[PDB]
Amino acid sequence: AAKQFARHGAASGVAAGSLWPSQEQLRELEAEEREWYPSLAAMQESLRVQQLAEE
Amino acid sequence: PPVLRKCELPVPAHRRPVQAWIESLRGYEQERVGLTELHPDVFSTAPRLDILHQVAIWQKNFKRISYAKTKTRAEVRGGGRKPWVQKGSGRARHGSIRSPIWRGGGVAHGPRGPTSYYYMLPMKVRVQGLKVALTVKLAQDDLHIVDSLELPTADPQYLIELARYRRWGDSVLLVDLEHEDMPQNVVAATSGLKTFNLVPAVGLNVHSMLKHQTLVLTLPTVAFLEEKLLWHNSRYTPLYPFRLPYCDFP
Amino acid sequence: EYPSFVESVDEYHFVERLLPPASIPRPPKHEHYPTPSGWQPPRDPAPSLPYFVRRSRMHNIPVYRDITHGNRQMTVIRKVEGDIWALQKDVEDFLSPLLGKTPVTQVNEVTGTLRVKGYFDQQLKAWLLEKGF
Amino acid sequence: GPRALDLLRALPRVSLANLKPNPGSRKPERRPRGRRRGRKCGRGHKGERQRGTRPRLGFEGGQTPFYLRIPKYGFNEGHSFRHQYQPLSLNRLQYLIDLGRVDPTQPIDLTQLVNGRGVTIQPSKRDYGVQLVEEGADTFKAKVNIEVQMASELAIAAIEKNGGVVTTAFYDPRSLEILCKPVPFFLRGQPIPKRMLPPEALVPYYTDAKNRGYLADPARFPEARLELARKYGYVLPDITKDELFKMLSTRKDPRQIFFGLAPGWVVNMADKKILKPTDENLLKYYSS
Amino acid sequence: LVCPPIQSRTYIPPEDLQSRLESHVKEVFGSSVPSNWQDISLEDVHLKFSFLARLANDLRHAVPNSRLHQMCRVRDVLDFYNVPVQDRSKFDELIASNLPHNLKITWGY
Amino acid sequence: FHVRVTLPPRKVVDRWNEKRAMFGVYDNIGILGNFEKHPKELIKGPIWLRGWKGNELQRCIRKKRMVGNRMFIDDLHNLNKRISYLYKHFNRHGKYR
Numbered sequence: 013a014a015k016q017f018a019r020h021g022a023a024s025g026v027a028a029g030s031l032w033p034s035q036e037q038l039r040e041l042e043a044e045e046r047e048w049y050p051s052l053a054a055m056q057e058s059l060r061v062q063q064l065a066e067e
Numbered sequence: 068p069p070v071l072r073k074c075e076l077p078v079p080a081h082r083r084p085v086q087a088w089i090e091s092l093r094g095y096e097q098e099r100v101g102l103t104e105l106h107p108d109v110f111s112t113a114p115r116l117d118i119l120h121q122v123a124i125w126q127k128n129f130k131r132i133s134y135a136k137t138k139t140r141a142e143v144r145g146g147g148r149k150p151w152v153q154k155g156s157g158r159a160r161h162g163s164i165r166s167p168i169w170r171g172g173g174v175a176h177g178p179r180g181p182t183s184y185y186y187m188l189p190m191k192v193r194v195q196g197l198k199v200a201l202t203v204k205l206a207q208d209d210l211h212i213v214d215s216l217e218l219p220t221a222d223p224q225y226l227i228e229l230a231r232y233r234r235w236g237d238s239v240l241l242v243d244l245e246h247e248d249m250p251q252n253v254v255a256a257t258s259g260l261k262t263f264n265l266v267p268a269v270g271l272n273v274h275s276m277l278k279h280q281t282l283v284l285t286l287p288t289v290a291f292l293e294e295k296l297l298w299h300n301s302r303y304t305p306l307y308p309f310r311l312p313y314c315d316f317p
Numbered sequence: 318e319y320p321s322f323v324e325s326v327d328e329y330h331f332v333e334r335l336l337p338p339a340s341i342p343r344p345p346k347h348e349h350y351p352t353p354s355g356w357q358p359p360r361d362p363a364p365s366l367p368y369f370v371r372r373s374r375m376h377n378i379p380v381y382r383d384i385t386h387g388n389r390q391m392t393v394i395r396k397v398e399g400d401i402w403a404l405q406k407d408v409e410d411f412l413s414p415l416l417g418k419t420p421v422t423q424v425n426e427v428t429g430t431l432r433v434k435g436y437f438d439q440q441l442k443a444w445l446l447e448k449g450f
Numbered sequence: 451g452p453r454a455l456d457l458l459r460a461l462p463r464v465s466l467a468n469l470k471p472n473p474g475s476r477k478p479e480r481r482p483r484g485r486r487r488g489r490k491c492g493r494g495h496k497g498e499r500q501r502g503t504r505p506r507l508g509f510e511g512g513q514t515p516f517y518l519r520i521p522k523y524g525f526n527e528g529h530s531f532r533h534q535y536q537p538l539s540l541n542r543l544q545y546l547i548d549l550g551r552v553d554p555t556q557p558i559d560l561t562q563l564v565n566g567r568g569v570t571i572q573p574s575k576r577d578y579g580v581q582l583v584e585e586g587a588d589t590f591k592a593k594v595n596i597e598v599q600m601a602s603e604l605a606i607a608a609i610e611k612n613g614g615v616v617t618t619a620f621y622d623p624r625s626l627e628i629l630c631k632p633v634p635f636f637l638r639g640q641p642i643p644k645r646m647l648p649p650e651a652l653v654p655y656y657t658d659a660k661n662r663g664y665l666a667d668p669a670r671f672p673e674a675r676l677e678l679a680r681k682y683g684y685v686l687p688d689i690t691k692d693e694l695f696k697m698l699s700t701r702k703d704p705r706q707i708f709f710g711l712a713p714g715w716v717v718n719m720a721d722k723k724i725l726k727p728t729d730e731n732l733l734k735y736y737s738s
Numbered sequence: 739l740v741c742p743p744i745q746s747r748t749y750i751p752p753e754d755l756q757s758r759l760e761s762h763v764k765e766v767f768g769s770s771v772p773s774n775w776q777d778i779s780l781e782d783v784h785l786k787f788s789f790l791a792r793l794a795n796d797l798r799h800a801v802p803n804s805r806l807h808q809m810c811r812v813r814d815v816l817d818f819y820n821v822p823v824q825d826r827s828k829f830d831e832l833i834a835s836n837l838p839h840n841l842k843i844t845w846g847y
Numbered sequence: 848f849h850v851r852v853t854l855p856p857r858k859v860v861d862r863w864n865e866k867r868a869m870f871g872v873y874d875n876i877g878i879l880g881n882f883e884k885h886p887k888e889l890i891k892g893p894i895w896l897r898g899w900k901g902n903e904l905q906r907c908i909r910k911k912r913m914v915g916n917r918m919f920i921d922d923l924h925n926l927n928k929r930i931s932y933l934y935k936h937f938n939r940h941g942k943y944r
């Protein structure tokens with residue numbers, strides 16, 4: 013259905029709101045990226061600990 | 068009122084365009100009613116008679132799907148038991164009554180299943196195949212340009228005598244730019260003839276040209292062919308298929 | 318629970334910059350030649366010579382190397398129109414002082430390709446550039 | 451030109467009855483029939499040769515094979531996870547500009563290089579972008595705002611000599627596939643996703659100002675630029691006084707993929723319109 | 739739609755070819771020196787059609803498609819009409835070639 | 848080795864029927880049609896052999912993948928035995944190895 017919208021869109025007859033993740037899906041996407049991909053602050057401080065430990 | 072046609076796409080500087088007469092089918096003697104210029108890179112290219120062999124063979128052996136499937140000794144109905152004990156009988160040793168040696172046995176090496184011969188020549192070779200075929204047709208006076216392709220009547224006998232008067236050979240290939248735009252007089256006249264065939268410009272290829280002894284190109288189709296065939300000289304390799312949107316190729 | 322969206326047409330000019338061209342652009346005009354990359358455009362008039370050497374679709378001299386059997390080194394000149402035998406003779410006496418002997422060449426008229434035994438691609442490209450092909 | 455066309459008038463018409471393949475293109479097949487290729491068919495006399503039951507490839511007849519008596523060492527250990535960078539030489543970068551393949555008036559990034567057929571990137575084969583090499587630093591006279599994924603000291607110095615801007619940015623394989631082939635992505639009917647952060651291994655490379663990292667502190671760029679100018683003895687141009695300063699200062703947000711586009715936008719190419727979300731959660735997720 | 743009789747592809751150059759060509763040039767060119775009329779160019783598409791069509795309907799011999807890119811000067815078309823064209827095959831040439839009294843040929847098809 | 852003693856009725860084949868005259872007309876649909884249909888979308892035949900080519904082993908494997916669930920019981924067994932024999936012959940037999 014999403015591919016038809018990208019092909020025609022106007023003639024596809026599908027609501028454009030279906031292309032974005034739903035609230036149930038958005039919560040799933042929010043948790044997965046947070047738990048697996050850390051933050052820049054966490055990465056920067058993690059490297060400082062190892063650099064101090066090895067030195 | 069002469070009908071002229073000057074080449075639109077840039078002709079290379081070191082060469083000059085080739086010219087051919089423009090004819091009309093509205094009358095027997097209505098020939099040489101103008102002059103048209105043909106692009107040298109299409110209608111005056113090198114006469115490659117071996118790049119035509121590859122394309123002509125390709126159009127013959129690219130959709131051939133054989134349907135021959137003989138049954139090997141595994142697929143025969145029976146013969147699941149040893150016919151006679153190997154030692155002591157006094158005859159040659161056998162293991163099944165369906166082996167290829169036996170009368171009713173299978174085939175040791177035969178055509179197996181539907182076999183497909185599908186190979187695609189690179190596109191620039193196929194394009195080069197069309198260019199050389201047109202040049203060969205023009206160089207041997209087998210190419211005639213017809214302006215707008217109209218006929219006085221729908222009688223199929225008119226085309227037969229017209230080709231006889233002008234010595235158009237035995238077979239003539241008539242082309243048109245689009246299917247829905249073909250006039251009713253031409254369609255009805257050529258629908259009852261075998262040696263005369265009408266094909267849209269998109270249905271043109273090497274095998275059809277070599278099948279019919281004479282090729283007829285319409286002036287709108289000539290501009291269509293030069294635009295499509297000269298685009299491959301200065302193009303890029305396809306990052307994604309051209310059916311997808313491109314910056315300057317819709 | 319479909320969310321809402323806003324349609325705009327003034328933000329589609331960025332997307333038009335992401336479309337590759339299907340045709341090779343002509344080289345832009347430069348005030349000074351040769352260009353820093355060594356590229357030198359062909360002379361405006363066609364040289365008054367029998368044979369002619371077309372440029373590549375990328376606007377470079379069509380002289381290439383080719384190796385076979387791992388020890389056979391050959392130089393190939395492609396896209397030649399006209400009297401090829403004139404090109405062969407001009408090559409023979411051009412490379413004669415450098416080698417002291419006439420180089421071994423193959424002439425393929427059905428294709429329009431001259432094949433020279435050895436790696437002379439750099440010398441040939443300069444030679445054809447001076448003649449303006 | 452084609453003097454062979456004159457010969458074609460005298461010769462008869464070319465049809466399907468007289469066509470010959472190029473001589474030497476089709477070597478004939480040899481079948482096992484006759485005295486020569488017969489009674490053995492080129493197999494041998496007895497053994498595993500004539501009966502076709504010779505051992506596998508690499509088996510030396512009971513003796514320990516050559517590929518089993520060599521101790522294991524890690525040459526390809528974790529090769530499927532090592533990052534690869536396609537090299538781009540300044541000789542080729544100069545070559546592209548002279549022929550109009552790319553233009554310095556418009557900012558150049560990875561997408562513009564691909565459309566110019568300069569480099570080909572395969573995201574599947576663990577390619578993380580293009581690295582700038584210094585093969586043609588001496589003859590580089592162009593002025594560009596180029597963005598790559600890895601740069602060398604001499605490559606950066608050569609560009610900054612003419613007054614250019616060099617910036618290194620990291621692209622996740624999910625984003626890099628979109629970046630290299632934008633048109634196929636826009637036909638998938640999916641919102642543009644956020645660009646992911648570099649892993650802990652690649653944080654120092656893009657955070658230090660020596661590598662012109664995209665995540666580096668901008669305050670340390672001017673002092674780092676002057677160090678290269680002092681080191682290689684070239685006068686550092688004042689880039690703020692050039693008329694193309696607006697173009698040369700253009701950058702991308704770390705969460706942004708394309709120029710001027712934003713995560714969460716849907717590009718409807720058929721209608722030539724751009725869609726944007728409205729919900730607070732959708733906007734927050736695509737902008738965090 | 740009366741069918742005209744089939745034409746014959748046989749051309750013999752007449753003795754007044756010089757006069758016919760120069761007369762045709764004057765009435766359709768009127769451009770260059772009357773003496774050096776054989777050096778006049780045929781580059782213009784309309785002018786070439788105006789000059790070749792008159793010759794075709796006067797000498798009953800039309801320049802084919804292949805040779806049109808060669809006929810660019812007046813001398814080129816003058817030389818073209820100095821070359822006879824024969825429609826008979828080799829056999830018909832042989833069947834009347836003063837054959838010896840012992841050679842007998844029976845064409846039967 | 849006895850041969851027939853009567854001349855067979857000569858086959859009067861017409862080279863200009865509908866099939867031969869229109870043979871291979873739209874082979875260049877992609878080249879002269881803005882690249883909208885590849886010439887492989889004109890092949891008529893088996894479902895698993897439209898625009899594909901391979902040896903005997905790759906053909907039998909491909910047939911089992913696509914139309915395997917639609918085949919008859921006896922045909923499904925014979926295909927399995929053909930795959931196993933070809934697998935053993937191609938890998939465990941031959942001269943060049």
Ligand SMILES: [K+]
Nearest residue numbers: 144170171172
């Ligand atoms: K039987």
Ligand SMILES: [K+]
Nearest residue numbers: 486487488490
């Ligand atoms: K033998």
Ligand SMILES: [K+]
Nearest residue numbers: 937938940941
């Ligand atoms: K084998």
Ligand SMILES: [Mg+2]
Nearest residue numbers: 141145146147
């Ligand atoms: Mg059995």
Ligand SMILES: [Mg+2]
Nearest residue numbers: 147148149162
């Ligand atoms: Mg048993």
Ligand SMILES: [Mg+2]
Nearest residue numbers: 149161162163
């Ligand atoms: Mg047995």
Ligand SMILES: [Mg+2]
Nearest residue numbers: 138171172173
């Ligand atoms: Mg049987």
Ligand SMILES: [Mg+2]
Nearest residue numbers: 382383384385
């Ligand atoms: Mg090679």
Ligand SMILES: [Mg+2]
Nearest residue numbers: 479480481492
């Ligand atoms: Mg052999």
Ligand SMILES: [Mg+2]
Nearest residue numbers: 479480481482
């Ligand atoms: Mg064989």
Ligand SMILES: [Mg+2]
Nearest residue numbers: 485488489490
């Ligand atoms: Mg024997």
Ligand SMILES: [Mg+2]
Nearest residue numbers: 494495496500
């Ligand atoms: Mg034996």
Ligand SMILES: [Mg+2]
Nearest residue numbers: 495496497498
């Ligand atoms: Mg032995």
Ligand SMILES: [Mg+2]
Nearest residue numbers: 511512513514
């Ligand atoms: Mg042992």
Ligand SMILES: [Mg+2]
Nearest residue numbers: 536570571572
């Ligand atoms: Mg690669």
